[PDB]
From a paper:
To characterize the conformational change between Cg6PGD_apo and Cg6PGD_NADP, we determined the crystal structures of both forms. Structural differences between Cg6PGD_apo and Cg6PGD_NADP were detected in the residual movement together with the loop. To predict the substrate-binding site of Cg6PGD, similar structures (Gs6PGD and Ec6PGD) were used to perform alignments, which revealed that the Asn107, Ser133, Gly134, Gly135, Lys187, Asn191, Glu194, Tyr195, Lys265, Thr267, Arg292, Arg454, and His460 residues were involved in the binding to substrate in Cg6PGD. In turn, the Tyr195, Lys265, Arg292 and Arg454 residues stabilized the phosphate moiety of 6PG through hydrogen bonds, and the Asn191, Glu194 and Thr267 residues also formed a water-mediated hydrogen bond with the phosphate moiety of 6PG. Docking simulations of the substrate were also performed to predict the substrate-binding mode.
In summary, we determined the crystal structures of the apo and complex forms of Cg6PGD with a resolution of 2.4 and 1.9 Å, respectively; Cg6PGD is the crucial enzyme in NADPH production. Cg6PGD eluted with a molecular weight of approximately 116.8 kDa, indicating that Cg6PGD exists as a dimer in solution. The monomeric structure of Cg6PGD could be divided into three functional domains : the N-terminal domain (N-term domain, Met1-Pro179), the central domain (CD, Asp180-Arg441), and the C-terminal domain (C-term domain, Ala442-Ala484).
Numbering used by the authors:
A (entry chain A): 4 to 484
B (entry chain B): 5 to 484
């Protein structure tokens, strides 16, 4: 009846609350539960006007106040807190019901949980939810994984709260089991890289070009008009514009430059290492966060490492404005490299786990409700639309056409930065990855040689299939392995 | 009597070679292998090398060991290793010693310690380097476990360990998984050492135009100086080898796909979760992953725009100043890799309660290991002078060297970029260096970005406490 809810949310911290309210604000009847009932009461009291909520003090009431097939969404801390609730819902649920973790869960746990829960006759969906607390309230990006029959009852509910971009719901069936939580973690990694490339551009503009932060804010606003158009560059301009009331100096000059990597960024570069994917952009970005928090080591390194002979833009004879454009092109290229790696990681996760994930879906639903939202994503959708089996976003004709006009600026940026001794982790590592991909012969041939010498590790040959070994200690003849 | 002092479980190449190491060094060695065919091949071929006491069952193997019983496990890492451990503990006496010598994950070793520690026994996780020739001819052995066990075990281990200037390349590392942890960091450092040699060889061949034969000759020249290493010495051989079938240099015929299928990745994962910037080892592992992506390489080869490129001739760069500039970029990039590697040891040591002495490692890595080089003595000296040295880069010797390395370092990154050649570790290392020097890093901006979109608080250089700016409202600042 109308006394039954279409969806329910277990765990009413700010995030679980915001998501329940979002379901209620878009005309869904929503059941809400929390072990400590005090939280439930505070939702009803302070936000009950936003729509039609059905509160329960027990798990068995919650499950009884839900229409069928029963959709419940868990929004408690990741790990053991989560498994607790999952077991409680299955004890109480009937066969054919759908259980959903919407918390930030390692995708390996999601596969374990999906096997066990499906075996118990139920249905398990792991659902990535970006946008933090704001997105959860006003429109997130939803990335759900589980049985495709479950998105049939779940899909239209999520399409009602999801961020909308040009009439299209920023949510779609990702693939089976852990695909959703996997793609959310890749998206958290591709954000560290986005924040890092912007940082690098800012650093080169402040210390090579001698631009104050208010003036750099203006340059980002103008770049936000072009191809780089993104929510992150938009807000970066707001931050650099800010002034500290107390001191009168730019707010950024009064913030301790120490940013922990205590987040998801490190899980992305780990699966990359496990799937054998060169994610140098996200890696360098995660590493750069670690280095910033080395307070004792930075204090001791300060002014104590030799710089070498350094020049400036004036002595090089470099026009400020030409250099600003060059940094913009270096930024763009480095973002492309980061994304090409991230989408490689997606394709490798998908093959390893037989997921059949469509990169087009991710590029489409990441246009709203998350921090990486940018017009840029549309060209990734188009690229895969033109060639499902594109071996790299770099090889898409549009992007390959762009690289043609980026490359010289990119090279000039790494050269100039070295000549002024300025930190450029992603810009420089992206160009090395680029020049690596385009090379006919890499120094791995010699690594194979070293390994065969010290460990009889074997090497393959260009002209003949199978493994081979040189009798290094012996006659230096070559034999089959 | 008629008892073995030490026993080896796992009679494949590592294990048979190890058992044969103990025997050749005049200990009596018990040998047992689940499948008995291997236990036979050993006695059949290498039984003449020393006194082996072979067993078909775990009971017989444990019956042949002198008390306190010492058995080394040399089998597949993972489920195969956890099984042999229970089979041993189910037959051993209180006070006996189980040693795992395989490439174990250090978190399983810490857990295996407490499981076995409980049952009255002692558990040792021992990193064994040097592959199969080192297992026979002299490995570096990095044992972690209870100190009171090294007393029984050390003298046996010192009898087979690689020996350098009369000092044995084995010593107690620290409690539980300390030994397996430093073995994993030694393997990560090995990838960086190999990658920097690659980058140099690449710039000598593609920027200077030297053929393999000539690169060999300049590598033996560098081996007389400060860079003396086993890796550079073998590199010159590899580079001199000619493939008989075609007549072209053997490395021109090798598929240039390394493959990161090793333990190099376990180092970066550990670094990532310990809050340590491992850009050298990281980029080294990344470069291996990239080399192996055949189909993406076939597709990108000749299809990505290079830009305008120059050569050394048009830059007016002298070949001889360039080859010495490359030598210094390699020396500095390797020094960055070692400093990050030793920061990971500090962190991992501090994360547990290990008190690991970095000096022991630089000392026992001088033999057995592929990374053995004269350079390690300088790391020992750096930590003798300052036990709390914040970075190897700051140790006065290393810092004095960097003074003379930095200008060549910058010219190499610059020249490589202008010739479109890939130099990942050389370039990652310089940004890390320039990061360490910077008074203000981009993390200040990142804190601002996070406070705006996630109310993720920030800190201030003047006042104390955490602060947030009402970005969506007044844009004022309110402590939280």
């Amino acid at each position: 009846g109308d006394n039954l809810a279409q969806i329910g949310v277990v765990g009413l911290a700010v995030m679980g609350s915001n998501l329940a309210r979002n379901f209620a604000r878009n005309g869904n009847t929503v059941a809400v539960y929390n072990r400590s009932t005090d939280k439930t009461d505070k939702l009803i009291a302070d936000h009950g006007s936003e729509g039609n909520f059905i509160p329960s003090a027990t798990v068995e009431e919650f499950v009884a106040s839900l229409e069928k097939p029963r959709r419940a969404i868990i929004m408690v801390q990741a790990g053991n807190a989560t498994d607790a609730v999952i077991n409680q819902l299955a004890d109480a649920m009937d066969e054919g019901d759908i259980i959903i973790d919407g918390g930030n869960a390692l995708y390996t746990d999601t596969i374990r949980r999906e096997k066990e829960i499906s075996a118990r006759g139920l249905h398990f969906v792991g659902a990535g939810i970006s946008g933090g607390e704001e997105g959860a309230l006003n429109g997130p990006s939803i990335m759900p994984g589980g049985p495709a029959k479950s998105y049939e009852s779940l899909g239209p509910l999520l399409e009602s709260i999801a961020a909308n971009v040009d009439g299209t719901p920023c949510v779609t069936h990702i693939g089976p089991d852990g695909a959703g939580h996997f793609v959310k973690m890749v998206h958290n990694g591709i954000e560290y890289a986005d924040m890092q490339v912007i940082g690098e551009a800012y650093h080169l503009l402040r210390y090579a070009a001698g631009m104050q932060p208010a003036e750099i804010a203006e340059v980002f606003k103008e770049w936000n008009a072009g191809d780089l158009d993104s929510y992150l560059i938009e807000i970066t301009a707001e931050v650099l514009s800010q002034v500290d009331a107390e001191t009168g100096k730019p707010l950024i000059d009064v913030i301790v430059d120490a940013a922990g990597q205590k987040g998801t960024g490190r899980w992305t570069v780990k699966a990359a290492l496990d799937l054998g994917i060169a994610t140098t952009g996200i890696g360098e970005a995660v590493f750069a966060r670690a280095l910033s928090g080395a307070t004792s080591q930075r204090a001791a390194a300060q002014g104590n490492l030799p710089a070498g002979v350094l020049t400036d833009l004036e002595a090089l004879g470099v026009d400020k404005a030409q250099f600003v454009e060059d940094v913009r092109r270096a930024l763009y290229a480095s973002k492309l490299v980061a994304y090409a790696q991230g989408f490689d990681e997606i394709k490798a996760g998908s093959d390893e786990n037989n997921w059949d994930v469509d990169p087009r879906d991710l590029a489409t639903i990441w246009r709203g409700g998350c921090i990486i939202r940018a017009k840029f994503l549309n060209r990734i959708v188009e690229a895969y639309d033109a060639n499902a089996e594109l071996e790299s976003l770099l090889l898409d004709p549009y992007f390959k056409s762009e690289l043609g006009d980026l490359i010289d600026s990119w090279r000039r940026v790494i050269v100039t930065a070295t000549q002024l001794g300025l930190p450029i982790p992603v810009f420089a590592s992206s160009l090395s990855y680029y020049d690596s991909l385009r090379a006919e012969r890499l120094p791995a041939a010699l690594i194979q040689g070293q390994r065969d010498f010290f460990g009889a590790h074997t090497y393959k040959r260009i002209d003949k299939d199978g493994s081979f070994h040189t009798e290094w200690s012996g006659d230096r003849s070559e034999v089959e392995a």
